[PDB]
Design a protein around this ligand. Structure first.
Ligand SMILES: [Mg+2]
Ligand SMILES: [Mg+2]
Ligand SMILES: [Mg+2]
Ligand SMILES: [Mg+2]
Ligand SMILES: [Mg+2]
Ligand SMILES: [Mg+2]
Ligand SMILES: [Mg+2]
Ligand SMILES: [Mg+2]
Ligand SMILES: [Mg+2]
Ligand SMILES: [Mg+2]
Ligand SMILES: [Mg+2]
Ligand SMILES: [Mg+2]
Ligand SMILES: [Mg+2]
Ligand SMILES: [Mg+2]
Lengths: 102, 144, 203, 210
RNA sequence: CGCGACCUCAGAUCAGACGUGGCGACCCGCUGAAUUUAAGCAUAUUAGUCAGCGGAGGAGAAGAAACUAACCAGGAUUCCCUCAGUAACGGCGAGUGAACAGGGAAGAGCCCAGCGCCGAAUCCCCGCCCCGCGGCGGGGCGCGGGACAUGUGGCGUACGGAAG
RNA sequence: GGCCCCCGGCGCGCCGGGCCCGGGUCUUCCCGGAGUCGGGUUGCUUGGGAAUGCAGCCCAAAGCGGGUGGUAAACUCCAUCU
């Protein structure tokens, strides 16, 4: 025939019909719920911020974003975790900026 | 330097107000073991002859316990929350003033977890919450 | 739902409120003895997460351990041998300090069973842990299924055989490619299997 | 010392091996003890199959063994759900279940539901109280038809679809098997770099005129 | 300005229980050499072994995936055969050295915390009565004590669960 | 093969009491373990090799997150577990 199943190539593999199904409930782990988000927001305004988080906000306030990321990565430890933390710290700065605007 | 989350529990109710609050709260104490037995036996006697189920309007009662009160505040079901000022592991109630204010339920801080315990026939209670109240005490609860 | 708030609160150990509480408590624990019974769990949510229940038979012991590594206990630093074994300082104990605190609680209270432990504070020179113990002969413990397992003879001194959560972490147990050292139950179990010469009857 | 030609040998006998030597003089005794336990277990579960629960049809993982099929740990919940068996009742009637096994394809799914439906048809169920047969089975098909089953229940067997000889068409004769394999390997190897070069060329194309 | 509640502590030859020490072939947690080999020797090897300390049971430990894989996918632990003296480590020297898949022995799965709902529904102790003794339980009673809302019990646990 | 004595677990009728509703469909809700993970460094350990595991010290999390995917790193998709 023109084309055959192959053990190599971009479309390699034995051909089976894929069984589509709902993902397992363990794969749901880590999703943020409405109540858990509410609790974490409660604790954040009760507690505040860690001293390194406040320092990183000063760097973001003067728009030293590369230096802020270097500082956060040195504190938290990894690039992926630092990028997520920097976005959140940028978000709270923007949130309190528009709160003080009105 | 005590952070305001911990310093807020030093502001307790004055003696006059705490007296009106506990005097009202005396009318809604949870039923003891003895009078629950008396009530349950009466239900058994009445069910035997001859009314039947007879819910008979489960009366308003003072809800107690930090886990119970927290859910009531989160559901906006509490009308008034009373927090003891001397919870020794002070993490059980540090969020409650902020949580109550966020949910709009009025809250006060009172002197003595032992006084709250006597309300519920126990040694100690962190918090008690006022749910719906009898009509003759709606005026009193509103003033508080 | 208050336990959820306390859990999120204790995840903020560097906040102003938690920094104050941890410092004051660490000062207070410094004034007490190294081994000391606590009237109640300091962290009730963390305790019950680890197996504790507020009923008779469960007791709490606060343990204070000294921080740092393990100096080799040789006279004048002389470890007579090859230079690879000359190390005296910068040596580290195989078991964590939490496992040591559990062992000290269990040794003192030999009639109780160590269940778990958790962190309540630390200094530059001390770490403080609270250990959950169970009285195996109290009727509340003994008449309850789902708790009767701790009453068995095989479960005595778990903290000394590395069977508690803290003591288990140093044994290198686990599933998959990172934990090939302990296939068979332990390092010794794996080592004996891999170093035994199987001489069959028919070779 | 080496002596003339020979193989460079590396014995692993430098580690006090004689303290850990496993002799096998209890091998014949071990086989007797295992046989006795098997026979005692079979007697204990008197009409139930001696080998145990039915096992699913399962393909072997890697590329070395994926042509073979064997018995798995237990039936997946997706298989039981479409076969109409409760996941908690299945273990009572001799069906092994594996809650952590997934079904990636439908062929393996449907292969195992015919296995469950075949087993369920061949199952003789005794009533809990023999004097009160509620919904299990008739007494006729369990008075004498009940017999302990020896060997695995419905043993998993590799099957081959025999192809009859056919006339080779011209399209099959013109197919280039070696050339296709060589080109398929090249296409998979250069797929990522071909896209990047096309992407870079597209960037130059959308601004080439200015 | 004494009397109460709680908290945190203390004493008792208080009522009732429990631990200690031995054995230690097998098992678990640590600590841990040097002889030796390298034709010297220091890394390496001996060896995570001897010695040392602690803790168990009739077995122990492990154990129901923060797994293996990359397949058309398998599916807790433990043991045997094989993988394999292999991948790898190594003054890349002497030497050391697993795992996956496959075939078997055996095969068994579950429980909390948390989120919630249920008038704390929960548990221990002490007196009284009856049925029993043989490892001390069953039932009933006590406006009898205590624990416990700083959280007991029932439902329920990632395979989803609850309520209509 | 016989006789004697003792002990233990198997079905039936009864006894004393407990014992409380299961599945499918739809709808509305609810879902998780923190000085822990992870990172740096140090020492030991491993076949684990730009670091397999364990531990001390310092830093110190997130929630479409986290871990793993045997070469360090950035971006991207996927797989797998929790
Ligand atoms: Mg050496
Ligand atoms: Mg006495
Ligand atoms: Mg002993
Ligand atoms: Mg030599
Ligand atoms: Mg020599
Ligand atoms: Mg020894
Ligand atoms: Mg065991
Ligand atoms: Mg275990
Ligand atoms: Mg699981
Ligand atoms: Mg070979
Ligand atoms: Mg070695
Ligand atoms: Mg078998
Ligand atoms: Mg509960
Ligand atoms: Mg790579």
């Amino acid at each position: 025939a023109l084309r055959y199943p192959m053990a190599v190539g971009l479309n390699k593999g034995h051909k089976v019909t894929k069984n589509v199904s709902k993902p397992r409930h363990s794969r749901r782990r880590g999703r943020l719920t409405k109540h858990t988000k509410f609790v974490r927001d409660m604790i954040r305004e009760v507690c505040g911020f860690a001293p390194y988080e406040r320092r990183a906000m000063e760097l973001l306030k003067v728009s030293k974003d590369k230096r802020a990321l270097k500082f956060i990565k040195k504190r938290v430890g990894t690039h992926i975790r630092a990028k997520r933390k920097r976005e959140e710290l940028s978000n709270v700065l923007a949130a309190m900026r528009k709160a003080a605007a009105k | 330097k005590v952070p305001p989350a911990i310093n807020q529990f030093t502001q307790a109710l004055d003696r006059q107000t705490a007296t009106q609050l506990l005097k009202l709260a005396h009318k809604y104490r949870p039923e003891t073991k003895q009078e629950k037995k008396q009530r349950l036996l009466a239900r058994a006697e009445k069910k035997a002859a001859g009314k039947g189920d007879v819910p008979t309007k489960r009366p308003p009662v003072l809800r107690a316990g930090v886990n119970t009160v927290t859910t009531l505040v989160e559901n906006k079901k509490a009308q008034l929350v009373v927090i003891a000022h001397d919870v020794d592991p002070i993490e059980l109630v540090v969020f409650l003033p902020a949580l109550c204010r966020k949910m709009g339920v009025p809250y006060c801080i009172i002197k003595g977890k032992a006084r709250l315990g006597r309300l519920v026939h126990r040694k100690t209670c962190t918090t008690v919450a006022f749910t719906q109240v009898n009509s003759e005490d709606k005026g009193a609860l509103a003033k508080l | 739902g208050a336990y959820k708030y306390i859990q999120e609160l204790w995840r903020k150990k560097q906040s102003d409120v938690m920094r104050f509480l941890l410092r004051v408590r660490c000062w207070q624990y410094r004034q007490l003895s190294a081994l000391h019974r606590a009237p109640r769990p300091t962290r009730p949510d963390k305790a019950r997460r680890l197996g504790y229940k507020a009923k008779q038979g469960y007791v709490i012991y606060r343990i204070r351990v000294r921080r740092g590594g393990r100096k080799r206990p040789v006279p004048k630093g002389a470890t007579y041998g090859k230079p690879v074994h000359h190390g005296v300082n910068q040596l580290k104990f195989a078991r964590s300090l939490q496992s040591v605190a559990e062992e000290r609680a269990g040794r003192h209270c030999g009639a109780l069973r160590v269940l778990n432990s958790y962190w309540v504070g630390e200094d530059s020179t001390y770490k403080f842990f609270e250990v959950i113990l169970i009285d195996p002969f109290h009727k509340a413990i003994r008449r309850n299924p789902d708790t009767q397992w701790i009453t068995k003879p095989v479960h005595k001194h778990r903290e000394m055989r590395g069977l508690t959560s803290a003591g288990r972490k140093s044994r290198g147990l686990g599933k998959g490619h990172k934990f090939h050292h302990t296939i068979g139950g332990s390092r010794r179990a794996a080592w004996r299997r891999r170093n035994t010469l199987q001489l069959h009857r028919y070779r | 010392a080496p002596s003339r030609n020979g193989m460079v040998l590396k014995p692993h006998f430098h580690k006090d091996w004689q303290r850990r030597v496993a002799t096998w003089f209890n091998q014949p005794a071990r086989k007797i003890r295992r046989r006795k336990a098997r026979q005692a277990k079979a007697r204990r579960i008197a009409p139930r199959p001696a080998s145990g629960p039915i096992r699913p049809i399962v393909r072997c993982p890697t590329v070395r063994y994926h042509t073979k099929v064997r018995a798995g740990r237990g039936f997946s919940l997706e298989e039981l759900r479409v076969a109409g068996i409760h996941k908690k009742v299945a273990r009572t009637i001799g069906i092994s279940v594996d809650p952590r096994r997934r079904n990636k394809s439908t062929e393996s799914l449907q292969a195992n539901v015919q296995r469950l439906k075949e087993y369920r048809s061949k199952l003789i169920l005794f009533p809990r109280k023999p004097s009160a047969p509620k919904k299990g089975d008739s007494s006729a098909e369990e008075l004498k038809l009940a017999t302990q089953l020896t060997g695995p229940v419905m043993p998993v067997r590799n099957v081959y679809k025999k192809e009859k000889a056919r006339v080779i068409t011209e399209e099959e004769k013109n197919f280039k098997a070696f050339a296709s394999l060589r080109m398929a390997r090249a296409n998979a190897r250069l797929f990522g770099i071909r896209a990047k070069r096309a992407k870079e060329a597209a960037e130059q194309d959308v601004e080439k005129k200015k």
